[PDB]
Amino acid sequence: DFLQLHRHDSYAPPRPGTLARWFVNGAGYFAAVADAILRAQEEIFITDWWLSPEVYLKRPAHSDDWRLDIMLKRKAEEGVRVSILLFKEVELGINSGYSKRALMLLHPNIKVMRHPDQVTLWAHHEKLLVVDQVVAFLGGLDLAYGRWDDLHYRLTDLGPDLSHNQFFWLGKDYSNLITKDWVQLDRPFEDFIDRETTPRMPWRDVGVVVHGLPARDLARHFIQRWNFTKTTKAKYKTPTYPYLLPKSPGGQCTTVQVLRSVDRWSAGTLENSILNAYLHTIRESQHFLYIENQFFISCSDGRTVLNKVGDEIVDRILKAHKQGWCYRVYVLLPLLPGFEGDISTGGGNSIQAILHFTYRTLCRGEYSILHRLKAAMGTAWRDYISICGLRTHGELGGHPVSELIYIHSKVLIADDRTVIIGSANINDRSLLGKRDSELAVLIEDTETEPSLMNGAEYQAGRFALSLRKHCFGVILGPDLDLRDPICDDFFQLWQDMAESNANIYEQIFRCLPSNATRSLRTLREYVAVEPLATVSPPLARSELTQVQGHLVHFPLKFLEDESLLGMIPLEVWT
């Protein structure tokens, strides 16, 4: 199975008959992770870009039960060997030193290695937990603060002996990473933003659990990285860090293939099979793509942006337009990048740098998707691609408040039949292989159910259709017909709701980003106006009843008059 590369040049072959189950949001994912830890008998393997030891896997907490570090300590006390690989930041505020020391203190059977020790731009980004080399969790969710959430996407959490606790996010877990970055992680149960005045930011993400052969394949990636990391410095070469060896509930039978991005620096071998699977899946798609991703930085110029995901999307749309076939691309992006900054004053240079490359993919310049579509078909591009974000509202301090829903997912769905779930963002950092290390699974359905595709009967895949309908249903908010994802009536309904919700949120909250602020000049005057939410809470509440779902148009004109791009290498942002 591992003497030679496979489909998409992956180290692992496709695995038919694999039981797999998807998760939307951290609540179900973290609870299933907890259940799997509890039943571990031999080994637990964990990779994290950030691991918060005191995070709770089930909420709300009333004791030390379900706290990550306590759960791992008890399993280690039972004889389970826990092996953990953490990213070593440049003291970023993730504080891997605190995580390492806390985990190593728990029990002698828990071993942690950090990497890299050299200065580099790139990171270990994959999120993985494997139990007994037979059950594997992956996706966009780190076992970290701020990640737990559910369909309620709560903006508030108002209700150390925890017996009477009612909070869902204790201490550092209550957070809004755009308002303020994490500080003082060695004080896990102390707030660092004002619960009474400062809404948290909802976190949307996608995970998956796979059983059997793909879980063993994922264990083999962990083992390869573990044994490679042993050789990186003298402390890790000793038997204190043992050589690891491959061991030769709602799940759907599928065909699953593991994919990864790794390089010499990260694993001692080269692979970019996530990128390969993305390009092949887009090229071979026949009806639609649904893309929910934290980043959308693509369209190659051969110099500053290299990955061709955006280029394959353009070619696929142009091909469908040339042949006269119905084809839709849904892109769901976070309305603002997840960096600390004040968007009312422009957002700061980190936010603006990401915004620059985001709009470069979307609609600004010769390489953008919309410029190349407009060139071939003019205004008809709106028939083939819709770019949206998510927003919600609640109440705090006696008046409505609003916040974007942070899309941290890294998922693609094609044709209601194929799904890619992993850690890889759509940017060069995740996809080129040479930069950040990443994991993903390509999930192809072999079992189907009768559905619709532009009005015709269509055998859709069970795993993909259930996931796609769950995304659409949450995003759109009973009598909605979600069977057909590309027919004219539904696509119009999608665009109408995205525009209607965006207009209402702008009328009530004057929230940013917005097409109303195309320069920093106009932004300065725009934010000096008090929004209706606080001027007249009753009038604001009445208008907010017309919102349905969370879908909002992604404003394509925000700060379009500014350049948005000093000595940091540009590849930091791509």
UniProtKB/Swiss-Prot annotation:
Leading EC class: hydrolase
Protein name (database record): Phospholipase D2
The keyword Transmembrane is annotated on this UniProt entry: no
Protein's membrane topology: Lipid-anchor
Enzyme Commission number(s): 3.1.4.4
Subcellular location as annotated: Cell membrane
Keyword line: Cell membrane, Hydrolase, Lipid degradation, Lipid metabolism, Lipoprotein, Membrane, Phosphoprotein, Repeat
Activity regulation field: Stimulated by phosphatidylinositol 4,5-bisphosphate and slightly activated by the ADP-ribosylation factor-1 (ARF-1).
GO biological process: cytoskeleton organization; Fc-gamma receptor signaling pathway involved in phagocytosis; G protein-coupled receptor internalization; phosphatidic acid biosynthetic process; phospholipid catabolic process; regulation of vesicle-mediated transport; small GTPase-mediated signal transduction; synaptic vesicle recycling
Higher taxonomy: Eukaryota, Metazoa, Chordata, Craniata, Vertebrata
Catalytic: annotated segments: 124-440
Keyword Oxidoreductase annotated: no
Organism of provenance: Homo sapiens
A GO MF label: phosphatidylinositol binding
Span of the signal peptide: none
Subunit (UniProt): Interacts with PIP5K1B. Interacts with EGFR.
Main location: membrane
Catalysis: reaction(s): a 1,2-diacyl-sn-glycero-3-phosphocholine + H2O = a 1,2-diacyl-sn-glycero-3-phosphate + choline + H(+); 1,2-dihexadecanoyl-sn-glycero-3-phosphocholine + H2O = 1,2-dihexadecanoyl-sn-glycero-3-phosphate + choline + H(+)
Purpose of the protein: Function as phospholipase selective for phosphatidylcholine. May have a role in signal-induced cytoskeletal regulation and/or endocytosis.
One GO CC annotation: plasma membrane
PTM comment text: Phosphorylated by FGR.
Tissue: Ubiquitous.
Residues of the PLD phosphodiesterase domain: 120-147, 403-430
Family: Belongs to the phospholipase D family.
